């Protein structure tokens, strides 16, 4: 009978519109920055080891021109103890990456926000926890001076390397009912999806590591659900 | 259509015959950065010399008939000529106030009709200071508001560049949205209020609800302030207090009736709500309050009330109801997300009752019958539109079921079948259809038994109905582009089930062949689709589903109880051989050299995605 194809009374029509969707400067996700997706690791405090997981929530990549200060990373961060008996700390964290156009690597492109003034140490602190990780030399080999190679770079999102700064703003279960006063330092590939990071805080110890990787679920296929913002 | 080119002529005449008297009269001394020329005139902030029309009637006259060209000439030039930008850049600082407005609604015209005038910065940047000069003048026309012009502004670039919005920027330099947000904290503490000063408040919520449509720094400067949600709340159970004072008084009154008067208030301060809902800290610390859910759901029932009983007091009186309520839920879709803490407050209180009731309505639904007793009810309530109704509450159901276990969805298809949401596969308004695939995707995510229902409902030929609907959605606008995102991973969704659904995928021939000519797009050939990454990404899981299950990965890899084997260690003969036919196929039908072609591709996600096909692809080849 074919009852949903001979009623449609859609109007089909291969027309322009006033404003064509090539002209609409959305955001884009990359395939280990999915909404829904889960990463594992462990984290070296003291001496001491932590299992740690990620679970994200809401991925806004910004593109060409971005004078917006909405988060471009958003997820969920638990710590759990792996050598102690020490309870499941559980957190929301926001992330922004590092573009080298307007959030360059060292904080003092970082424009004086209320907002973004919990992401900014020292362009010191930021060099040596930047100089850690090898790709950022790869990087940077192909003060001042590092601005000002730094201007000109291609297109971040065309890049194997992704580096960004992770903040925790509150607890996850009821934020009602402080000690995530710092902040990571992390670097993710893309390739291989795998997320390393330092962790700064003032009064604490210094170059706490994160090394996390892709969670492997039980089924190869896989399915896909969507959400939007109205 | 022949009196409107004729008055078309005769105005552009008025204003030519005037304006060429007082043409000699520009004059901008300008330096371009690289002589009586005029190159490089749109390079600097500069206008020419303050013009003024000596003659009073003169200046009426070309006042009067510039402002109905502007209201004739796109229907059938001036724009276009230099001289007379200048000519009317130069009236911009005139001494008549008539002049002044009609020269800023002259030069503010082609951003919101021609395609691709949002690029024109630097115009926008000459424009803008005298527009704030224009907020400060006593005696105003009635045809210019200036409060309209800045939010159609914000509006335009907030809907074209999320994020990056001009306007914004250019007004915090130059200190005028402290002001703009003090007027508004003042506007909200006068102690004696009347009809002007809550139309002058709904503008400065409309204004302000446009600042954080698309900006988290406005949105926290504007919940640092303690005392604006009490009066949201405040203006929410004064409308529902009114709306339920008129109910309770329908049987004495009972024809033109005037609407509610603060219709525009309860309308700007749903926007509010919106802009502020849309981010999850706000949603997760600040919007935590019960009230603002409970004063929704009130909202809804409410109006719908409203337009069930009440259809006599006409169309002028529920036009802005429909509207409440399409507010409403968008608001309400906004705060059913997983990841915020009020949904289950949602569930508990019953909303998927209310747009079961919704939805099922006649006047909502038109694949149902009228009654044959409210016939005066469908000739009074006709003629309104309800798209965004139906759309919005689509929305909230696809929001329901993201990320869900099949309880919930068993529930939702319980109080809500799938025949209802059938009936909305074909709305001609293009946001009922796009919500519809997408509440379709996200119910037959991870679950077998809901492929069944949807192939038994479609008892097969869904796949043709598929292809036939990518065939004829344009690409080119949001909305379609939309529901053929959701069709592509509905086949996504659909052929990651068993074997049997791979099977009936992969024996479709047009599908193969829409994913080939999605697959070939380039830079130089986006012409059929637009060279759009998504549907590539979307067609490469397709032929990744197709072609990965557990026994090839035991095959390709290897050579309660506190410890079980893994499923890939764990009959596997008979399915490796038709996964590899399956693979023998896909090499015939030609999609190897798309997959290498879009090795060579530009985006690095599709690359690397195409880089992982093919190697597997190219292991079970061997």
Known sequence: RKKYIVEDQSPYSSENPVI???????????????????????????????????????????????????????????????????????????????????????????????????????????????????????????????????????NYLNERFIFMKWKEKFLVPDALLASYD???????????????????????????????????????????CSFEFA | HYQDFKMAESLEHIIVKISSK?????????????????????????????????????????????????????????????????????????????????????????????????????????????????????????????????????????????????????????????????????????????????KTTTKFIKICASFAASDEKYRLLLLNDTLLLNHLEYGLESHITLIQDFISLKDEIKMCLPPIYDHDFVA??????????????????????????????????????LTKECYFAGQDFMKPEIMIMGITLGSICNFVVEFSNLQSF?????????????????????????????????????????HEVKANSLWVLRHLMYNCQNEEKFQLLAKIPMNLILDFINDPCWAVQAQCFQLLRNLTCNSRKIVNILLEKFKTYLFEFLAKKMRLLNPLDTQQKKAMEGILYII????????????????????????????????????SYGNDSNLKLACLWVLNNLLWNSSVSHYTQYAGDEFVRTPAAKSNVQVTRATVERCRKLVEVGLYDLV???????????????????????????
């Open chain 2, 596 to 622: 290498r072609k879009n090795i060579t591709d530009e985006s690095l996600s599709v690359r690397e995605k195409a880089r992982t096909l093919l190697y597997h692809m190219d292991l079970l080849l061997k």
């Open chain 2, 22 to 198: 007082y043409l000699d009269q520009i004059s901008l001394k300008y330096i371009v950065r690289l002589p009586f020329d005029n190159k490089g005139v749109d390079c600097t902030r500069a206008i020419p010399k303050k013009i003024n029309i000596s003659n009073m009637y003169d200046s009426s006259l070309l006042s009067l008939a510039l402002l109905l060209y502007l209201r004739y000439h796109y229907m059938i030039k001036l724009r276009n000529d230099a001289t007379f930008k200048m000519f009317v850049l130069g009236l911009l600082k005139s001494n008549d106030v008539n002049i002044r407005c009609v020269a800023l609604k002259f030069l503010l015209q082609p951003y919101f009709t021609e395609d691709k005038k949002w690029e024109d910065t630097r115009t926008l940047e000459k424009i803008l200071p005298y527009l704030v000069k224009s907020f400060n003048y006593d005696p105003l026309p009635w045809w210019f508001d200036p409060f309209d012009m800045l939010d159609s502004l914000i509006v335009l670039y907030n809907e074209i560049t999320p994020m990056n919005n001009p306007v914004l920027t250019t007004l915090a330099h130059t200190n005028v949205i402290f002001c703009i947000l003090s007027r508004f904290a003042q506007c909200l503490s006068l102690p004696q209020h009347n009809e002007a000063t809550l």
């Open chain 2, 346 to 386: 949602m569930l508990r209180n019953g909303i998927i009752d209310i747009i079961e009731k919704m939805l099922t309505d006649p006047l909502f639904n038109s694949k149902k019958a009228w009654d044959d007793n409210e016939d005066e009810r469908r000739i009074a309530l006709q003629g309104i539109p309800v």
């Open chain 1, 20 to 154: 064509v969707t090539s002209s609409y400067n959305h955001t884009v996700c990359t395939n280990y920055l999915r909404p829904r997706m889960q990463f594992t690791g462990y984290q070296i405090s003291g001496y001491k080891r932590y299992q740690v997981t990620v679970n994200l929530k809401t991925v806004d990549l910004p593109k060409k021109d971005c004078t917006s200060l909405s988060p471009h990373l958003s997820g969920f961060l638990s710590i759990r103890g792996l050598t102690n008996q020490h309870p499941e700390i559980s957190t929301y964290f926001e992330a922004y990456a590092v573009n080298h156009k307007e959030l360059g690597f060292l904080s003092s492109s970082w424009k004086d926000e209320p907002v973004l003034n919990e992401f900014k140490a020292t362009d010191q602190t930021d060099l040596e926890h930047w100089i850690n990780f090898p790709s950022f030399r790869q990087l940077f080999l192909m003060i001042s001076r590092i601005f000002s190679q730094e201007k000109q770079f291609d």
């Open chain 1, 182 to 224: 710092g902040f990571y330092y992390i670097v993710h590939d893309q390739v291989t999806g795998n997320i390393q990071g330092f962790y700064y805080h003032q009064d604490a110890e210094k170059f706490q590591q994160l090394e996390l990787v892709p969670s492997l679920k039980n089924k190869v296929e896989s399915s896909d």
């Open chain 2, 268 to 305: 700007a301060w749903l926007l509010l709500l919106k802009s502020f809902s849309r981010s999850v800290s706000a949603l997760r610390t600040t919007l935590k309050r019960n009230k603002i859910a409970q004063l929704l759901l009130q909202i809804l029932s409410k109006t719908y009330t």
């Open chain 2, 492 to 527: 996504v969704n659909l052929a990651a089930v068993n074997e049997n659904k791979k099977q009936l995928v992969i024996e479709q021939d047009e599908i193969l062949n829409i994913m080939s000519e999605i697959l070939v797009e380039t830079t130089t050939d986006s012409s």
